[PDB]
Amino acid sequence: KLEVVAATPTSLLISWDAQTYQMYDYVSYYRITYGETGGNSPVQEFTVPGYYSTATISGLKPGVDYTITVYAEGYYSSYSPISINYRT
Amino acid sequence: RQWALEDFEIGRPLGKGKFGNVYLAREKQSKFILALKVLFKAQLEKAGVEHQLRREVEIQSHLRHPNILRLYGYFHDATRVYLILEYAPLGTVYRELQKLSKFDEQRTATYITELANALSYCHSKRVIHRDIKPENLLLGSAGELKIADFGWSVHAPSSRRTTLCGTLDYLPPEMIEGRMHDEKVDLWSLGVLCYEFLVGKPPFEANTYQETYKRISRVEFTFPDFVTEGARDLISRLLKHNPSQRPMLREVLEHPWITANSSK
Ligand SMILES: CO[C@@H](C(=O)N1Cc2[nH]nc(NC(=O)c3ccc(N4CCN(C)CC4)cc3)c2C1)c1ccccc1
């Protein structure tokens, strides 16, 4: 569902183009959360507008198991989270 | 907020659409006059334009510029889709052009100035309109230009931009020739628009779409004699076959013909 397109020891390029939405249910913005897999860190987050299909997460630790999660937050719905694990 | 039909007072119909009507409306909380566009879902899915509706709402809802028609929000029930839009009382630039046949240089340069300011705002967000034409332009209370209809718009980093879209007389050549396109297609259609404002007809008009695609691809157009040298210079700079040669909107606003004729 979620896909990592490009890779860099300090940056990742994710894309949620495969995530299909309900008809007449339009997305307002996205909540993208990333952090060390299995850890107890607070997990960093940020938002992009709803018309985005890709996003660039920068400033990460090389050689670290990360968990990328995207929350599609529509104007009248909250879609199920989609995740992916990628090692920088 | 969770908008609904119960939140607006509905008045007379303002105009007609392809899949519904636009009504004059008022938000009961603030008594603020707005425009309510109704779109019947049955007429939408029959035309297969639902994806363009999703594009217009998800993009235009984030654009806040004095020369862009605001989309305050939307909602929908079982049969219709509602768009809460900014009220433009003076109508479309298309009807004003039908009345006056053609615009003078002062009114045209002021329109191009306002349109370039809104496009510079859109391009600053990597948003391309891809459908600039007089039928998509509304006029504000003081006569200011407002760009509407963002169904063909696109977020450049979120698309490959290899599919042809827009209006026949305003299509850029890179689209007809099947090449990847970017923000420069708005610069081409801006030059096509500047020609129609001063002349009254688009430059690549033809009796069939075969010839129009051919005339655009080869940039085959001429100016009437009443077009001043400053206007020909801008249109020629905008109607370049190579998208990289087309100027930046910052330079269009700084062009001597705009500087000497635009009111804004
Ligand atoms: C069909 O969608 C509408 C749309 O979305 N919209 C959103 C929105 N907001 N305000 C609008 N104004 C009018 O529809 C309108 C029509 C005629 C009018 N007059 C006619 C009579 N005159 C004596 C005075 C002026 C004045 C205003 C519209 C249309 C649209 C139409 C054209 C371009 C872009 C969008």
Numbering used by the authors:
A (entry chain B): 9 to 96
B (entry chain A): 126 to 389
Extract from the study:
Herein, we provide the quantitative framework for double-drugging using two targets: Aurora A kinase (AurA) and Abl. Both kinases participate in various cellular pathways, and their dysregulation results in a multitude of cancers, such as breast cancer and leukemia.
In contrast, the ternary complex of AurA-danusertib-Mb1 displays a broken salt bridge, as K162 interacts now with danusertib, while maintaining the α-C helix in the “in” position. Thus, we propose that the K162-E181 salt bridge in AurA-Mb1 must be broken for danusertib binding, as reflected by the lowered binding enthalpy. To confirm that apo AurA-Mb1 complex establishes the K162-E181 salt bridge, we deleted danusertib from the structure of AurA-danusertib-Mb1 and carried out molecular dynamics simulations in triplicate.
